[PDB]
Amino acid sequence: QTLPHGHMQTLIFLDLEATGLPSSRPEVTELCLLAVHRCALESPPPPPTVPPPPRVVDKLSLCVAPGKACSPAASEITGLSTAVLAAHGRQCFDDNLANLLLAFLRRQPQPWCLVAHNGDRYDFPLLQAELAMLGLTSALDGAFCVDSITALKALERASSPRKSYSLGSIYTRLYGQSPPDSHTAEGDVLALLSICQWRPQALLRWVDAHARPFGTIRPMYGVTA
Amino acid sequence: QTLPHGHMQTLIFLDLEATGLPSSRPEVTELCLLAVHRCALESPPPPPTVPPPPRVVDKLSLCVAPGKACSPAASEITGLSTAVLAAHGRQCFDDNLANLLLAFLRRQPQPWCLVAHNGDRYDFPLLQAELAMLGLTSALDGAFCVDSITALKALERASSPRKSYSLGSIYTRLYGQSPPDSHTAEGDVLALLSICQWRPQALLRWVDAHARPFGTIRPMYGVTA
């Protein structure tokens, strides 16, 4: 099927930062969602330069207090530590946060498609795990999702030694400069948006064909329901 | 009283963009909230350069479909028009949006203080008016608010022909460069944050003394309750 779930109407670019690797039972420290209606990517289009983001976007960036320490590597990479987060009064991943995320999604036309780089192995199962610990094991079931590593592999294969498909590797290969020297969830989402604007119509075709119901993502840890 | 309502814990920088001037019964087209815990401004500190934003911030930026046309001047300034907003599937100012705003505020330690440039004459009464049309005439009553025009007038008077206190005028006077060439609610909030970081401890003293309960803001139009 070219449209198993119809055309995705809104792409919600997502990044989660957390306390450590999956084997550590990590907890979210920061999240960013950037919602872009598909029409911002419905465009007919020398080495390219970074495109500007669409004018009409919705953005949500939040810091979150985990119930455990960040690993030294995580704090090095993200600039967040549990003491830093506590000094700023950050709250845990709770029911109010889940309601905020859903209310943000409800501002967007459906179908919704979350887009995250390495989402299938990290961001999506982690988000499912945090919701599972709250017993909100179906809260995001209305959403679809795709992993942009898989997408960009497909787009680059159709477009043309093995390449890396890390976010930074793709961005620098496409645009000849490194993504803005930022270490935030928002920075990662903005860089992902830029890579998704490289071949935007081809991206939308791939997304429509591969969109996966979020309820089929198994949680990284915690209960399934 | 130096602390009529205690120390404000979180400053939520706010900008609203809308369809026209107050005399036109305007409706919101875009909003941005940027929440910064006060500790990011509790710092002892040649011509200065623009300071970087704090690492730990929460951000929400949303576009909104008004129930009427934008004025030509408004669309010129903001890049938004009702057709553009409709093409991106934007939703009106509704109950879900009000709930989203409140859930965002509930991520922040209280007391909350909204900070908006010209807020007393524009952003605060307009936000009250939109909530009033939904019958949510006390939804934000827990918040306090201050107008940064009044604040910066006070700070510059203590620090040193008449000056303009428009956002751009203050920013260029303090930092010797114009605020990033952006025409978005988020851009205005980021520029306001930068000006509030000029004399941050003095700003916090002024804010604590002048914080005003949001429920005392009369709506620009609509019912009072």
Residue numbers in the entry:
A (entry chain A), B (entry chain A): 4 to 48, 53 to 167, 173 to 237
Sentences from the paper on this structure:
TREX1 is a cytosolic DNA nuclease essential for regulation of cGAS-STING immune signaling. Human TREX1 is a 3′-to-5′ exonuclease composed of an N-terminal DNase catalytic domain (amino acids 1–242) and an unstructured C-terminus (amino acids 243–314) implicated in membrane targeting. Loss of TREX1 function results in accumulation of cytosolic DNA, inappropriate activation of cGAS-STING signaling, and severe autoimmunity. The overall structure of hTREX1 adopts the homodimeric conformation previously defined for mTREX1 with enzymatic active sites on opposite outer faces of the dimer.
Reasoning that reduced thermal stability and poor crystal packing may explain the lack of structural information for hTREX1, we screened each hTREX1 chimera for the ability for form protein crystals. We identified conditions for the growth of hTREX1 Chi 2, Chi 3.1, Chi 4.1, and Chi 5.1 crystals and determined three crystal structures (hTREX1 Chi 3.1, Chi 4.1, and Chi 5.1). A 1.25 Å structure of human TREX1 establishes a complete model of solvation of the exonuclease active site and a 2.2 Å structure of the human TREX1–DNA complex enables identification of specific substitutions involved in DNA recognition. Solvation of an enzyme active site is a critical parameter for protein-small molecule interactions. Notably, the high-resolution of the hTREX1 Chi 4.1 structure reveals the human catalytic active site in exceptional detail, including 18 well-defined waters in the core of the enzymatic pocket providing a template for structure-guided drug discovery. High-resolution structures of hTREX1 and hyper-crystallizable hTREX1 variants now provide key insight and tools to facilitate the development of TREX1 therapeutics.
